[PDB]
């Protein structure tokens, strides 16, 4: 549970603001904003946004992820997890890390999984 500011403060694509501090990527996809835990779901390393290649490269066992977190290569077996994102009373985005949405169980499609912006 913390704040990552106003939706305006982001552009489409991948932001690495709170990567060092909160171990997250904040991604605005087409219509929407969502928050990716930078935690490889192979064993546990911290992968690396690679804008050139449109990819989060995990340096642990090569695992590759698309900009939406989908596991596309390497040993990683499932997409990178996502956190609940809500607008506060002050309009700023609260992230709640103790709720998580698993893209391969249709959890990205349920409330708090993203913000429409
Ligand atoms: S922990 Fe990321 S590839 Fe193994």
TrEMBL record:
- Cofactor(s) of this protein: [2Fe-2S] cluster
GO CC list: membrane
Keywords from UniProt, A to Z, are:
2Fe-2S, Disulfide bond, Iron, Iron-sulfur, Membrane, Metal-binding, Oxidoreductase, Transmembrane, Transmembrane helix
**EC number annotated for this UniProt entry:** 1.10.99.1
Report which superkingdom the organism of origin falls in: Bacteria
EC class, as a word, reads oxidoreductase
Q: Which residues form the Rieske domain?
A: 9-94
Which molecular function GO terms apply here?
2 iron, 2 sulfur cluster binding; metal ion binding; oxidoreductase activity
Any keyword Oxidoreductase?
yes
Q: What is this protein called?
A: Similar to Rieske 2Fe-2S iron sulfur protein (Cytochrome b6-F complex)
Organism of derivation: Kuenenia stuttgartiensis
